[PDB]
């Protein structure tokens, strides 16, 4: 991933401040919520109709502890991040069957929530280096696709 | 297809905006601009700069058009149709691109408006603006 | 805004196909499949090998449908509503997905249908299957 | 960009068949066709109204035919495409202005013309590495942009 020596003491310096736990899992429940065509992989989860029931569904934010847990798990492994994410690209392929473009919807809303949780903080010139480490880490986890 | 869920709820939530309009879409611009870089060449004459009363001008513009796309979004198609040409015959702005903003102009939305920013509220301001951005594309062929 | 311009363009594009719809459909995926590799995840119980009457049997699927859309095209929303429906709430395909194969069942006609295929006839092949693909998606919120 | 040893010996050599001149003045000719989006940048260009006019304005014909000539111009500089088109990826940006989509709509229909021109030549495991030399002369062609 393309990153300045400068931006970064911005891009993973207020992640930090963050909770994998809920906002990792308020994330994805939220990405059921507006973005709904990534439910199809997310079906024996009970239910996750209504938004107060896909942003309070158990699983769901337990899902989005983890899902970030890499996403953290990598935030200081930007200089390889495509092949951190490696084995976990080459699974959402065969296993899952998870669409490469999935990881970029989810990506977005992380940086909608992480706006959400961060208010004022959130710069214009701090969004930018973060869209990098998401449209970045979205490749990552699409490039061992065959 | 646009629920009165969204309308109502946008109703609310772009309106606790108003008077923020100016800056709110002034700075949704500028977060375009520094993330995506793909959307200053279609803005030569202007300034991506910060506080460039271009865009900062321009703030108000692409803003306080989505006012009137809120209010008279009972007739979107009729609400703003001069726009919806001066585009395609005057400057287009690539389909595409419009979601390089559409994504952009919910941030200003999402830490400017927590409280009011809600998981439903993400659905109801995306679907206003993924219709908004393609209201004007109608006469794009 | 689709023309009559495209409408009668396909309706006598797309009309030299007919028996064909069952190979230029069956091999139009199969091209969707080795260009783009995100478009065999949603074929898991599949075959992604050549000739297999999955894909080869879909092929007098997802065409044999298109051909009731340039007929109905007159009111494709109600030309196939049980197939705008059948997609988002029983199988959805991702909307960027229909994209995937609205570009490469442009091949299958680029190629199979050359004398046919000209410039206006691929905006006017383009223009429909810009809209085939939208119309299912009506009903994805 | 990323090429197999072997499909090369079939996204190159086919390409030799081809016109520059007509076919890459017919792929961009189409272009302003049916993705009308392009000609914000071809204004003086005459007319290009009706497609007859478009498939011709002369001017559009000419363009297309130097177009091609490094799109031909680095069919075998494979291993530096992003190179190559350095110098010529930032003028598109801050003289023409040109948006790096573009780019891209392009790179698809000289894949729509190819097959056009082509036929069964075509075959399926032959249009897979060639997108991947246009999505990817794309990039190249995108890289310098800030
Ligand atoms: C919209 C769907 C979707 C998205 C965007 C997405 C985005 C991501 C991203 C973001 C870039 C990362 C790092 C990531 C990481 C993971 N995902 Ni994702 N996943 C998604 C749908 C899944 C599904 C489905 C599973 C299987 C879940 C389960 O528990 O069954 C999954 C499982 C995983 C696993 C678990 C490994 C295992 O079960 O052996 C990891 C790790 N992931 N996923
Ligand atoms: C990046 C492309 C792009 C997108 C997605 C976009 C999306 C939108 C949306 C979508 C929700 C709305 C309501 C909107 C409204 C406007 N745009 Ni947009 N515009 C875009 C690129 C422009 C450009 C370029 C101009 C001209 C600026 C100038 O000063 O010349 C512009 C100018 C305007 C004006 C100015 C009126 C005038 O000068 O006469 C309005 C209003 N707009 N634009
Ligand atoms: C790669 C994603 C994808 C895309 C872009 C896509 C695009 C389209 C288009 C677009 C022009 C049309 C007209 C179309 C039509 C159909 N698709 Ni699609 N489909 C896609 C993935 C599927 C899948 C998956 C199925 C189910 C196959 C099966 O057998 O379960 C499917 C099934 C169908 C069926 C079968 C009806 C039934 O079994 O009841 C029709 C008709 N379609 N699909
Ligand atoms: C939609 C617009 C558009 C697209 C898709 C496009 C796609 C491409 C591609 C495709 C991958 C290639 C290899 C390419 C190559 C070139 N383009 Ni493009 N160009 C485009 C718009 C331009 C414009 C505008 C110019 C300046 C033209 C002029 O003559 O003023 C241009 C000029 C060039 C030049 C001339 C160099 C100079 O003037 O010093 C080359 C070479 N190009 N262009």
Redesign the pocket.
């Given at each position: 991933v393309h990153l300045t020596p400068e931006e970064k003491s911005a891009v993973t310096a207020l992640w930090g401040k963050v909770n994998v736990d809920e906002v990792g899992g308020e994330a994805?429940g939220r990405?059921?919520v507006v973005?709904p065509?990534?439910?199809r992989?997310?079906e024996?989860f009970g239910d996750l109709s209504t938004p107060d029931a896909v942003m309070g569904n158990p699983?769901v934010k337990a899902?989005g502890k983890?899902?970030?847990?890499?996403?953290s798990d990598?935030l200081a492994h930007l200089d390889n991040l495509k092949g951190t994410?490696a084995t976990?690209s080459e699974?959402?392929c065969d296993?899952?069957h998870?669409?490469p473009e999935?990881?970029?919807?989810?990506?977005n809303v992380?940086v909608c929530v992480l706006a959400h949780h961060f208010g004022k903080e959130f710069t214009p010139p701090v969004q930018a280096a973060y869209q990098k480490v998401?449209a970045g880490?979205?490749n990552?986890?699409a490039h061992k696709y065959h | 297809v646009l629920s009165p869920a969204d309308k109502t709820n946008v109703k609310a939530a772009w309106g606790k905006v108003g008077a923020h309009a100016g800056e709110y879409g002034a700075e949704a611009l500028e977060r375009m601009f520094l993330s995506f870089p793909t959307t200053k060449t279609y803005f030569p004459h202007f300034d991506l700069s910060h506080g460039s009363a271009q865009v900062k001008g321009h703030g108000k513009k692409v803003a306080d058009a989505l006012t009137n796309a809120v209010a008279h979004v009972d007739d979107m198609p009729n609400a703003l149709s001069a726009l919806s040409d001066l585009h395609a015959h005057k400057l287009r702005v690539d389909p595409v691109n419009f979601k390089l903003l559409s994504h952009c102009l919910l941030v200003t939305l999402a830490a400017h408006l927590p409280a009011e920013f809600t998981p439903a509220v993400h659905a109801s301001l995306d679907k206003f603006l993924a219709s908004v951005s393609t209201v004007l594309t109608s006469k794009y062929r």
């Open positions: 994805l990405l059921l973005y065509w990534t439910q992989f997310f024996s699983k899902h983890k899902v970030l847990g890499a996403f990598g994410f976990l699974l959402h296993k899952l998870v669409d999935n990881f970029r919807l989810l990506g992380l998401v880490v979205a990552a986890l | -």
